[PDB]
Amino acid sequence: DPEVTLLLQCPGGGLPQEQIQAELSPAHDRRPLPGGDEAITAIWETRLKAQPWLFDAPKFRLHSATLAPIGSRGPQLLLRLGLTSYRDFLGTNWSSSAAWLRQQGATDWGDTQAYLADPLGVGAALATADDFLVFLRRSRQVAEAPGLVDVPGGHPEPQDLAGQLVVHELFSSVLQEICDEVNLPLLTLSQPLLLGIARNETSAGRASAEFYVQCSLTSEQVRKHYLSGGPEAHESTGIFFVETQNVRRLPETEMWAELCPSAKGAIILYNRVQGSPTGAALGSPALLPPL
């Protein structure tokens, strides 16, 4: 799958909030463009003169992540984070010259991302009480991946000693996105586990943190909540469910061609980190069928 690469796969079935450290530093920001940040300002001004109701918003930037030696005690992951914006995204990753900026970054900084906003996304593998994952159909009128299948998530907005607060807002924001889009009560959801980080090679390498969340409702009760909001309660245009049994081979189905890259990352990491049984009991051939 050329349109998604794994930057990180978490150990132990995924990491809770308490085993993650963040470092939020202006050293983790995008570098100023070789010819000045004027190019981003020009693209923004042009866009507002066609859509004057658009507004900017701050975003987190992923610079890098380091995993501890496996089986160790203490914090297991460090996230190195800066700040970016929707405006900087439109002028870099979403720019037609995005591939030229990646080449210039390799040359100048030995880093394909050095000149890119790279806003951090979040997505969820959301499992029901009756063992399904939750999918959403994207509107055909949106800018990115129109009409494709997605999972719940989005792009959290800011606001280890400021670090711990940053880690809490990331985990809080995946739950809030599930409540806003799927119309579920907060109290039907587990604390999320981080499965890993996935890069969207169709959006110049920007990264999404991918999480596992369990709901205490069945698929049928999840569907009821989603629909009972009506058309204005959600950006998506439909909800559907796949048994966890059948998620194992999803990359061999006709659905795979309709999944947006960030939802591909969520399913690949769910299959590696929550599936793939390591032990003699869940490993047995009747429970884990060959081929």
Place of tokens 């009756």: 130
> Interacting stretch for ligand MH5, rule CB under 6 A, among 84-92, 100-108, 267-275, 278-286?
84-92
By C-beta, is 86 or 171 nearer to ligand MH5?
86
Least distance from ligand MH5 to the Cβ atom of residue 192, Å: 20
CA distance 230 to 218: 20
Q: Is 138 annotated as a binding residue?
A: yes
CA distance 3 to 200: 6
Least distance from ligand MH5 to the Cβ atom of residue 85, Å: 8
**Residue choice 86, 132, 135, 270 for contact with ligand MH5 (CB under 6 A):** 86
- Give the count of residues interacting with ligand MH5 (CB under 6 A): 9
CA distance 115 to 92: 7
Instruction: Looking at residues 54 to 73 of the shown chain, list those that interact with ligand MH5 (rule: CB under 6 A).
Output: 59
**Extended strands (E) in the chain:** 4-9, 20-24, 58-67, 77-85, 121-127, 132-137, 149-150, 153-154, 193-200, 206-214, 238-243
Give the orientation angle of helix 163-182 with respect to helix 219-228, to 10 degrees: 80
By C-beta, is 90 or 215 nearer to ligand MH5?
90
Q: Count the residues in the chain.
A: 291
Least distance from ligand MH5 to the Cβ atom of residue 59, Å: 5
Which residues are within 8 A (CB) of 199 and not within 5 positions of it... i.e. 6 or more apart?
Answer: 4, 5, 6, 7, 205, 206, 207, 265
Q: Is 262 annotated as a binding residue?
A: yes
Per-residue x/- track, 140-169, ligand MH5 (CB under 6 A): ---xx----------x--------------
44 interacts with ligand MH5 by CB under 6 A: no
CA distance 22 to 222: 33
CA distance 125 to 62: 21
Instruction: Looking at residues 89 to 128 of the shown chain, list those that interact with ligand MH5 (rule: CB under 6 A).
Output: 89-90, 94, 119
By C-beta, is 30 or 225 nearer to ligand MH5?
30
Instruction: Summarize as ranges the residues that interact with ligand MH5 (CB under 6 A).
Output: 59, 86, 89-90, 94, 119, 143-144, 155
